[PDB]
């Protein structure tokens, strides 16, 4: 699966999912560090 942080953008929409697929810039940076280990 794909992890969705609690501190992400809340989709202010009742007709769909309550959380968005975007992420914090820190989350993007820390994801890159984790993805670097995947490439090793």
């Amino acid at each position: 699966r794909q992890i969705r942080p609690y501190y992400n953008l809340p989709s202010k929409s009742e007709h769909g999912r309550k959380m968005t697929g975007f992420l914090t810039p820190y989350r993007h940076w820390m994801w890159k560090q984790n993805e670097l280990w995947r490439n090793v």
Partner: protein, 250 residues
């Protein structure tokens, strides 16, 4: 991949065939399709001689052969003259004239564009007049060298195409030979007297200081769509390679 013959559905019924691309002259997508070919043709004419591109006068063709010889014919004239039996339409659409922006700026400023429609409505003559000499250098042996517009001053280009036809209808694919210009080499050539003026250097100068570093990097504050490597999008969403990541937020 697509390497399968059609056997699931009958040939008489086109069940999943892609639509055929058709260009309409009532829409600006015609200018969108044709303008880069025009600028490439102008560059080719200015660089190397091109047959049948220079026009002494408007070609005269009888009505029976009008639909047989005129389509596909593209050339240029020094004067701003228009063929007969054609009603004139002027480009008053900013979206339509936007597509000639690169031609106007980088190649040569365009004075006007007109679409000519015959009485039988079975042809289209795109006549585009450029005012002013070519910004790019013109070789003395090039086709445009015989044109007085280079070096009134304005010169026009005529293109004939059948209406409501695929984009391959115009025969602008053949005008794509990339003949280079000799602008820098002419300076050092024997005819020019700058060969002694020019001073070449073989050894690079010594370096005393390191290059100035980039300013302090500030991480973005807005939210991010995610990694481009995973999302398979090009670096800036425009060009580049997915594997080679650059130019994004990090």
């Amino acid at each position: 991949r697509r390497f399968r013959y059609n056997t699931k559905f009958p040939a008489l019924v086109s069940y999943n065939k892609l639509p055929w691309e058709v260009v309409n002259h009532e829409t600006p997508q015609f200018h969108m399709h044709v303008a880069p070919h025009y600028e490439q043709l102008l560059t080719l004419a200015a660089s190397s001689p091109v047959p049948h591109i220079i026009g002494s006068k408007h070609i005269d063709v009888p009505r029976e052969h009008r639909l047989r010889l005129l389509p596909g014919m593209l050339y240029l004239l020094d004067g701003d003259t228009l063929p007969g039996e054609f009603t004139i339409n002027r480009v008053l659409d900013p979206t339509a004239l936007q597509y000639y922006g690169r031609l106007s700026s980088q190649i040569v400023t365009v004075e006007a564009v007109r679409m000519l429609v015959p009485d039988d409505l079975r042809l289209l003559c795109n006549c585009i007049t450029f005012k002013g000499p070519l910004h790019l250098p013109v070789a003395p042996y090039a086709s445009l060298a015989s044109l007085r517009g280079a070096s009134s001053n304005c010169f026009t280009l005529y293109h004939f195409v059948r209406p409501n036809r695929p984009p391959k209808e115009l025969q602008l694919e053949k005008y794509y030979i990339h003949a280079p210009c000799v602008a820098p080499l002419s300076e050092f050539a024997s005819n020019s007297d700058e060969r002694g003026n020019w001073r070449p250097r073989l050894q690079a100068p010594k370096r005393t200081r390191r290059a100035t570093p980039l300013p302090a990097y500030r991480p973005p504050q807005s939210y991010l769509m995610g990694l481009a490597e995973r999302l398979a999008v090009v670096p800036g969403g425009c060009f580049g390679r997915r594997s080679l990541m650059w130019g994004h937020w990090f």
